[PDB]
Amino acid sequence: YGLDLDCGAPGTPEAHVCFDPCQNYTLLDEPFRSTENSAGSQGCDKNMSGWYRFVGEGGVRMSETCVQVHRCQTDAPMWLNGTHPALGDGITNHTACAHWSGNCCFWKTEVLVKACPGGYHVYRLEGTPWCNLRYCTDPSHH
Ligand SMILES: *[C@@H]1O[C@H](CO)[C@@H](O)[C@H](O)[C@H]1NC(C)=O
Ligand SMILES: *[C@@H]1O[C@H](CO)[C@@H](O)[C@H](O)[C@H]1NC(C)=O
């Protein structure tokens, strides 16, 4: 990835093919991701790949603060150990932390975040480091 665009696999004939993540994401409207949701059969975001936008009642952004365990329809909820970028900051690299066993960063993994025209953010999410972990959404951001 570059300042504004993400590109194809290095070392392949698609390595020069780049796109704006703000125009090429998977849309998720999954209220169960809410940091306030304590129900549901725990699941795991192990299959995630590429860029994602979150919408709906569960919230439109990842949480910037540690989430209590057994929220977001998962066991170890994941939150953004960083500050969201502003539009014009480009693609930014961040740490996501999973809360477990008295440790708000028991697991960590890299996530990319970009602010987009129209007042939304997109996230590049590549699996999880363990299960059951999920990337939560904060419903305070409507
Ligand atoms: C969208 O991004 C994925 C990777 O997340 C890529 O494989 C695909 O080619 C992209 N599509 C377009 C139209 O840019
Ligand atoms: C990540 O979280 C820890 C614990 O709150 C904090 O010390 C650190 O400054 C955070 N890092 C960023 C980039 O926000």
Numbering used by the authors: 42 to 183
The publication says:
Glycoprotein 2 (GP2) and uromodulin (UMOD) filaments protect against gastrointestinal and urinary tract infections by acting as decoys for bacterial fimbrial lectin FimH.
The electron density maps reveal that the GP2 branch is a protein module (henceforth referred to as ‘decoy module’) that consists of a β-hairpin stabilized by a disulfide bond (Cx48-Cy59), packed against a globular ‘D10C’ domain with a new fold including two 310 helices, nine β-strands (βA–βI) and five intermolecular disulfides (C163-C8157, C285-C9172, C3107-C6145, C4113-C10177, C5138-C7146). Interestingly, although the GP2 branch also binds FimHL, its D10C domain cannot be glycosylated at the position corresponding to UMOD N275 (R165). In agreement with these considerations, introduction of an N65A mutation in the decoy module of GP2 impairs its interaction with FimHL and mass spectrometric analysis of the glycans attached to N65 detects the HexNAc2Hex5 oligomannose structure, indicating that UMOD and GP2 exploit a common molecular strategy to counteract bacterial adhesion. Because of 60% sequence identity to UMOD, the crystal structure of the latter immediately explains the effect of many substitutions affecting invariant positions. Remarkably, most of these mutations cluster within two structurally important regions of the decoy module, the β-hairpin/D10C domain groove and the disulfide bond-rich region at the opposite end of D10C.
